[PDB]
Design an enzyme around this catalytic site. Structure first.
Site, short mmCIF file in Angstrom:
data_model
loop_
_atom_site.label_atom_id
_atom_site.label_comp_id
_atom_site.label_asym_id
_atom_site.label_seq_id
_atom_site.Cartn_x
_atom_site.Cartn_y
_atom_site.Cartn_z
CD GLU A 94 0.59 3.19 8.46
OE1 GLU A 94 1.66 2.58 8.69
OE2 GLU A 94 -0.48 2.61 8.19
NE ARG A 95 6.04 -0.34 9.67
CZ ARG A 95 4.91 -0.77 9.14
NH1 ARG A 95 4.14 0.03 8.42
NH2 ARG A 95 4.53 -2.03 9.33
CE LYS B 212 -2.37 -0.93 3.72
NZ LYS B 212 -1.63 -2.17 4.04
N1 LIG Z 1 6.39 -2.48 -6.16
C1 LIG Z 1 7.02 -3.31 -5.33
N2 LIG Z 1 8.07 -4.01 -5.79
C2 LIG Z 1 8.70 -4.85 -4.96
N3 LIG Z 1 8.44 -5.11 -3.68
C3 LIG Z 1 7.40 -4.40 -3.25
C4 LIG Z 1 6.65 -3.49 -3.98
N4 LIG Z 1 5.64 -2.94 -3.20
C5 LIG Z 1 5.81 -3.51 -2.03
N5 LIG Z 1 6.85 -4.40 -1.99
C6 LIG Z 1 7.26 -5.20 -0.84
O1 LIG Z 1 6.58 -4.71 0.31
C7 LIG Z 1 7.49 -3.94 1.13
C8 LIG Z 1 6.87 -2.60 1.45
O2 LIG Z 1 5.55 -2.81 1.99
P1 LIG Z 1 4.48 -1.60 2.13
O3 LIG Z 1 4.37 -0.83 0.87
O4 LIG Z 1 4.90 -0.78 3.34
O5 LIG Z 1 3.09 -2.29 2.49
P2 LIG Z 1 1.96 -1.93 3.56
O6 LIG Z 1 2.01 -0.49 3.92
O7 LIG Z 1 0.65 -2.35 2.89
O8 LIG Z 1 2.24 -2.87 4.74
C9 LIG Z 1 8.81 -3.87 0.36
O9 LIG Z 1 9.92 -3.89 1.24
C10 LIG Z 1 8.75 -5.12 -0.52
O10 LIG Z 1 9.17 -6.28 0.20
MG LIG Z 2 2.34 1.16 4.96
#
Ligand SMILES: Nc1ncnc2c1ncn2[C@@H]1O[C@H](COP(=O)(O)OP(=O)(O)O)[C@@H](O)[C@H]1O
Ligand SMILES: [Mg+2]
Ligand SMILES: Nc1ncnc2c1ncn2[C@@H]1O[C@H](COP(=O)(O)OP(=O)(O)OP(=O)(O)O)[C@@H](O)[C@H]1O
Ligand SMILES: [Mg+2]
Lengths: 46, 50, 166, 523, 487
Positions: E189-190, E163
């Site tokens: 969030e973080r 996300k």
């Molecule tokens: N476009 C992408 N390409 C590769 N890995 C991705 C991508 N989007 C997310 N990830 C994976 O997810 C991680 C980041 O998660 P994040 O975007 O913070 O999700 P959320 O906020 O939904 O928990 C990255 O470190 C990788 O492991």
């Molecule tokens: Mg997130």
């Protein structure tokens, strides 16, 4: 299929019961904290 | 005890005009000595079972 | 001269002369790290001169601390400092830093790290000093003649069932 | 000139590990979330924490020590201050309580501080080597990062964290103390015997010199178990605010939640999901937000968090488990099926993730990990569905991820590089560990007198930092690395694999099997 | 009792983050901000917000900071109104908190006006019909679920599905060249993610400290108490509403995560004497979210293009909080963990997404037809997967094998490398034009690329990148064959 259906029925019944018990426990906790204050009424007039 | 209470009373500025009254309470937790409590200021000069 | 800014754009103190003087007055080179920590806390990032002073303190100090520390190595500390400087601070080590490392390698008798640092200086720097190379070669020849070129146990013949896997 | 305390009331009721006070008329009153002393004797006191300030004036207290001495009707003194515990380099190598009291073995930091501001942090760019090839490659961890360790009971959650703490002993002894990693091991609701065993294990490897243990055993009240993580991080924040790096381990947050739920329920707090208090997420959220990577303007220190969480039957849909997963910057999922299948550590690479990414990897590890990730992804995709190069190397990579003790960076990176460049294609999967052991703890070139390298040898442990500085794929080291790998592969194959494939006798077969099993647990 | 500014009260109860205040002259109106004037030796000021009236004199409030060192009978003074937040172009490039105080340590901010964070949502007569496609540069979003300008977008997904990365990509693609202003609201969030976003925006010149910035940041994070996480969104939305109305500009509003607002309300609900609802959320879950959502809309004065990230606890899309947000959006992007585990990024499940402008009247006929064909083919492939699992690919008919091949190529062709996930992927990202995506997918559907290798469609951009990757694959395969030939 029969085994999974039995598990599904059992799990849904348990989930409904657990959710209802949780809600009622929260309600009972809220009710218990409530304290009945002093009654401001004409006690002698009786 | 009276001396300690008077000294505590002198320190407290709010109780400058207040009169000093001493009330005695029996405490079974202390075997020797005494303690004084005035307006929240507590002075411990007692001992208990060793 | 020119104000320096941090990651977020906040200005950072650049007068790092007193800290270098403090570094040049330490007895044990682990105390030099404390000066660097104080510099970082005081928003005064070290410059190339500060790292060279720290390397000099490491080379010229008797030991890491007042009491001996097991498995302590001056070469490892200086290499870690250089890695920090180049990677986490974006500062290219100059000739002075590599000469300090080569001097430490020669002093400690490690003639193989001497060869590696010699190649490094020849590649990045404008060659390695002749004196250091000759001293390293002398150490290597002395080790070879005495028979201590490699650990003895490594040269012992082994077999499929003659190796003790701890 | 008297040591006048501040009496605020008396003890009214006692219900297990919590109590309720009644204020004496016309008294100063106690402040919220402050420490109070219950006068169990004219010279002895029992600590307590204010939790509730009711309309009636009664005060909800969380007893911390000397609970058996607490009786109804005893005087209570108010200190008027929050909880502060000793902090400094003088606490390392000791076992302490959440209140700071030292536990005999056979500066003051506020426990309720706030997390660093948004502009007080910097990107995570410094790696924290756990010592395991699987984690260090596929799940990078950087200093200032919160990495969850989730799994089932008896899957290695504690072992991996203790190994990570121990892995820093060798590094700290060589590099300057500026970059040394201090450890704060927090035990929550664990057995007292386990704490003693962990202390002895740390002492054996010499990790007590850089580590302090904070223990709240199962026999202690829930208050200490509830405060253990906060006291531990507070002890770890002392080094963060002074340009140093620390590692905090919480073993485990699952039991802290239980203690907090007990405290809340006993003090008449409305229950929530699974009877937990409504603000159960916020507890861990503010606990883990205090681990950060300070900006260069504030010193550059950091705290790395390794919270541990237990699941039931690999169910990550639980309440607290989900909350912790949604807080940390990653997760090392230890799978029970992999653990029983012989894979140890049982790191489920599919379910594990590090959100920091390659930013928390050294330059030397970056390229190896980048290629390894693609190879493993292709191997898993093809395996789920023909001995192609990805499939030949993926199996050997999986074989190399089995470990019992943390591995030195030089050995691990060299072995991964060898397996990555096809140097193990001719080596059978069963013999990969034996090949790695010979590469690390032996030198075939010197043994057979065919080594022409000048400096690059596996017995020169000082090459670890040269490799970390320049990388393996550099002209300085690449040529000698390839020469050493070629010589080792040739000598290994010829002099060992031919004989190993020629064993038929039951005695020799059993001896070889024992040798291979020992190698699995040796490197 | 009209002007309650300066009215004095006393703290009567403190249980967690909820505090009760007693006023002798009458409790001020609900949502009023109160300041704890008493000197309690605190390192931070304490402010309370009235949420309920217990009687004519008592009022239950929620604190915005930690209630530590708070005593009973502590003096409290009303602020004369709700929580106010600075507004105007002077807030561009700055970082604020729930209370509207700059936290970037960049000096005082020159504020000419302040607005309360609680406002009435626009009425029916204040609704503007804006049906215009928003090109995000992402093949999946542009094709299956196109976004509309001035509309509401939702990124539903679990933990770690991507996300945040999608939000960063949308920022990089839409905000750098945006004509108007932007407002990013970090909710529960973080904090490190906020720092990373701030650094990225400064590097991308969206926040030009020396020049002119074009975005505002309002952060209430996990470390903050539940009181601040339930009002940071209101503060950011108030800033966006001012930019929409007074400035008459087209503003972007990024919210991450909108679920934390509901979570904070649920956390505080228990102490407010409210019986929990099903699952365990507050009984006012629907109305509390609806009031905030109705304020995030485009009116006849200006337009707000809102992108919201929705967290689905434990991937349970049926959870009441995620389920209540679907009806408040114009375009829903549902992420799936299964897709992510297969190496497909962004992990979008096209069979669960939906868009309001997916109509021939709004978008071109070719776009609508291609999107519908892609969806139908994916559904057919999902149906055929079961038969393949039972029987096998060899058992399927030739008419079905072609569908299987095309569907696999479509599945791999939906993946795209983002310019913000270069560290995660290690490859440069792509920005695919809307027309290029339509043409590429239309060609793929009719079999123009049946002879192209399947892996040529994996993690690429338009059709040209597919052909280049196919050429590279052919070259390396030829090299491998030559190596084998010599052996
Ligand atoms: N476009 C992408 N390409 C590769 N890995 C991705 C991508 N989007 C997310 N990830 C994976 O997810 C991680 C980041 O998660 P994040 O975007 O913070 O999700 P959320 O906020 O939904 O928990 C990255 O470190 C990788 O492991
Ligand atoms: Mg997130
Ligand atoms: N890498 C490993 N290789 C071999 N054995 C291991 C490894 N890691 C752990 N073990 C062993 O597995 C068992 C369980 O390990 P550990 O105590 O770390 O599990 P845990 O997750 O803490 O479980 P719990 O705390 O619930 O008992 C122990 O006997 C330990 O020695
Ligand atoms: Mg354990």
């Amino acid at each position: 299929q029969q085994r999974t259906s039995s598990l599904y029925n059992k799990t849904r019944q348990f989930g409904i019961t657990a959710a209802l018990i949780e809600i009622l426990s929260a309600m009972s906790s809220l009710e218990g904290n409530a304290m009945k204050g002093v009654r401001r009424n004409k006690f002698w007039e009786g | 005890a009276r001396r300690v209470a008077e000294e505590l009373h002198k320190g407290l500025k709010e109780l400058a005009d207040y009169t000093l009254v001493l009330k005695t309470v029996v405490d079974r937790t202390i075997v020797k000595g005494f303690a004084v409590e005035l307006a929240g200021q507590y002075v411990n000069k007692a001992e208990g079972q060793q | 001269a020119a104000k320096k800014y941090d990651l977020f754009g906040y200005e950072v103190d650049t007068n790092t002369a007193p800290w270098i003087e403090k570094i040049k007055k330490c007895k044990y080179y682990d105390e030099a790290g404390e000066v660097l920590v104080n510099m970082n806390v005081s928003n005064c990032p070290p410059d190339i001169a500060t790292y060279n002073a720290t390397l000099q303190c490491i080379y010229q100090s008797p030991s890491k601390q007042s009491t001996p520390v097991d498995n302590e190595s001056k070469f490892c500390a200086m290499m870690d400092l250089l890695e920090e400087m180049q990677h986490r601070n974006r500062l290219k080590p100059n000739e002075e830093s590599w000469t300090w490392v080569m001097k430490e390698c020669v002093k400690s008798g490690q003639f193989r790290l001497g060869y590696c640092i010699q190649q490094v200086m020849e590649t990045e720097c404008k060659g390695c000093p002749a004196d250091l190379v000759k001293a390293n070669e002398a150490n290597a020849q002395k080790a070879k003649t005495e028979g201590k070129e490699h650990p003895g146990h490594l040269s012992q013949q082994a077999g499929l069932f003659d190796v003790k896997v701890e | 000139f008297f040591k006048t305390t501040e009496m605020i009331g008396y003890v009214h009721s006692i219900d297990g590990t919590i109590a309720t006070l009644i204020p004496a008329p016309g008294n100063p009153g106690v402040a919220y979330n402050t420490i109070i002393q219950i006068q169990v004797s004219p010279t002895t006191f029992a600590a307590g924490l204010v939790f509730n300030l009711e309309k009636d004036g009664r005060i909800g207290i969380i007893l911390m020590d000397n609970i058996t001495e607490v009786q109804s009707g005893q005087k209570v003194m108010a200190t008027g201050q929050l909880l502060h515990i000793p902090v400094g380099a003088g606490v390392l190598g000791k076992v302490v309580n959440p209140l700071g009291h030292e536990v005999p073995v056979g500066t003051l930091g506020k426990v309720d501080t706030g997390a660093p501001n948004i502009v007080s942090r910097s990107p995570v760019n410094y790696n924290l080597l756990t010592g395991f090839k699987a984690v260090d490659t596929m799940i990078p961890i950087g200093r200032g990062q919160r990495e969850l360790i989730v799994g089932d009971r008896q899957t290695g959650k504690t072992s991996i964290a203790v190994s990570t703490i121990i892995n820093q002993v060798r590094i700290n002894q060589q590099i300057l103390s500026k970059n040394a990693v201090i450890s704060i091991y927090v035990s929550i609701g664990q057995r007292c015997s386990n704490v003693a065993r962990i202390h002895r294990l740390l002492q054996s490897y010499g990790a007590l010199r850089y580590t302090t243990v904070m223990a709240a055993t199962a026999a202690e009240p829930a208050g200490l178990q509830y405060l253990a993580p906060y006291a531990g991080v507070t002890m770890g924040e002392y080094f963060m605010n002074r340009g140093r790096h620390c590692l905090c381990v919480y073993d485990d947050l699952s039991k802290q939640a239980v203690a907090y739920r007990q405290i809340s329920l006993l003090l008449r707090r409305p229950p929530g999901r699974e009877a937990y208090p409504g603000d159960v997420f916020y507890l861990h959220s503010r606990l883990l937000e205090r681990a950060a990577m300070l900006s260069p303007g504030k010193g550059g220190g950091s705290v790395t968090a390794l919270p541990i969480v237990e699941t039931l039957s690999n169910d990550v849909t639980a309440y607290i488990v989900t909350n912790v997963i949604s807080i940390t910057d990653g997760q090392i999922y230890l799978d029970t099926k992999l653990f029983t299948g012989g894979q140890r550590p049982a790191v489920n690479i599919g379910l594990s993730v590090s959100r920091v990414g390659s930013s928390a990897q050294n330059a030397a590890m970056k390229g190896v990990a980048g290629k390894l990730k693609g190879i493993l992804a292709e191997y898993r995709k093809l395996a789920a569905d023909v001995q192609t190069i990805p499939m030949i190397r993926g199996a050997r990579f999986v074989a190399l991820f089995n470990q019992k003790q943390p591995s030195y960076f030089m050995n691990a990176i060299v072995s991964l590089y060898a397996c990555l460049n096809g140097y193990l294609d001719d080596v059978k999967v069963q013999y990969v560990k034996f090949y790695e052991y010979l590469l690390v703890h032996r030198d075939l070139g010197i043994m057979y007198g065919t080594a022409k390298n000048k400096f690059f040898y596996m017995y020169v442990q000082e090459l670890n930092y040269l490799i970390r500085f320049f990388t393996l794929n550099s002209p300085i080291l690449h040529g000698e690395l390839e020469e050493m790998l070629k010589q080792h592969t040739h000598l290994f194959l010829q002099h060992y694999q031919s004989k190993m494939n020629a064993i038929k006798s039951e005695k020799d077969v059993k001896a070889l099997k024992n040798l291979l099993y020992s190698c699995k647990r040796a490197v | 009792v009209a002007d309650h500014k300066g009215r004095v009260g006393h703290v009567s109860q403190v249980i967690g983050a909820v505090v009760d205040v007693h006023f002798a002259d009458g409790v001020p109106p609900v949502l009023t901000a109160l300041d704890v004037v008493d000197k309690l030796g605190r390192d931070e000021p304490l402010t309370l917000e009235i949420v309920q009236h217990l009687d004519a004199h008592t009022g239950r409030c929620i604190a915005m900071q930690t209630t530590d060192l708070l005593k009973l009978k502590a003096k409290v003074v009303s602020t004369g109104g709700n929580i106010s937040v600075p507004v105007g172009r002077e807030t561009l490039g700055r970082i604020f908190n729930v209370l509207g105080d700059a936290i970037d340590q960049r000096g005082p901010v020159g504020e000419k006006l302040r607005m309360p964070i609680h406002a009435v949502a626009p009425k029916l007569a204040d609704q503007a019909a804006e049906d215009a496609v928003l090109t995000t540069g992402i093949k999946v979003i542009d094709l299956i679920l196109p976004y509309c300008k001035g509309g509401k977008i939702g990124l539903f997904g679990g933990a770690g599905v991507g996300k945040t990365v999608i939000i960063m990509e949308l920022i990089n693609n839409v905000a750098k060249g945006h004509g108007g202003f932007s407002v990013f609201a970090g909710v529960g969030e973080r904090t490190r993610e906020g720092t990373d976003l701030y650094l990225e925006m400064m590097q991308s010149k969206v926040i030009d400290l020396k020049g002119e910035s074009k975005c505002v940041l309002v952060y209430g994070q996990m470390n903050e108490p539940p009181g601040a996480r339930a009002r940071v969104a209101q503060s950011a939305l108030t800033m966006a509403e001012y930019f929409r109305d007074v400035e008459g500009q087209d503003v972007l509003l990024f919210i991450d995560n909108i679920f934390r607002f509901t979570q904070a309300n649920s956390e505080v609900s228990a102490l407010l004497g409210r019986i929990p609802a099903a699952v365990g959320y507050q009984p006012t879950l629907a109305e509390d979210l609806g009031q905030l959502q109705e304020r995030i809309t485009s009116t006849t004065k200006g337009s707000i293009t809102s992108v919201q990230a929705v967290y689905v606890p434990a991937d349970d899309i049926t959870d009441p909080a995620p389920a209540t947000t679907f009806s408040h959006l114009d375009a829903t992007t549902v992420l799936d963990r299964a897709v992510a585990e297969s190496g497909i990024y962004p992990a979008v499940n096209p069979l669960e997404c939906a868009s309001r402008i997916m109509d021939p009247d709004v978008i071109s006929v070719d776009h609508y037809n291609v999107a519908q064909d892609v969806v139908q083919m994916l559904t057919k492939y999902r149906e055929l997967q079961d038969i393949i699992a039972v029987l096998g690919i060899d058992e399927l008919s030739e008419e079905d094998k072609l569908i299987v091949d095309r569907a696999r190529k479509l599945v791999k062709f939906l993946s795209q490398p983002f310019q913000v996930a270069e560290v995660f992927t290690g490859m440069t990202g792509h920005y695919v034009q809307l027309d290029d995506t339509i043409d590429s997918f239309s060609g793929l559907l009719m079999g123009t690329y049946d002879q192209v290798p399947e892996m040529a469609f994996y993690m690429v951009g338009g059709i040209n990148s597919v052909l280049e990757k196919a050429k590279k694959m052919a070259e390396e395969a030829a090299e491998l064959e030559k190596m084998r030939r010599a052996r």
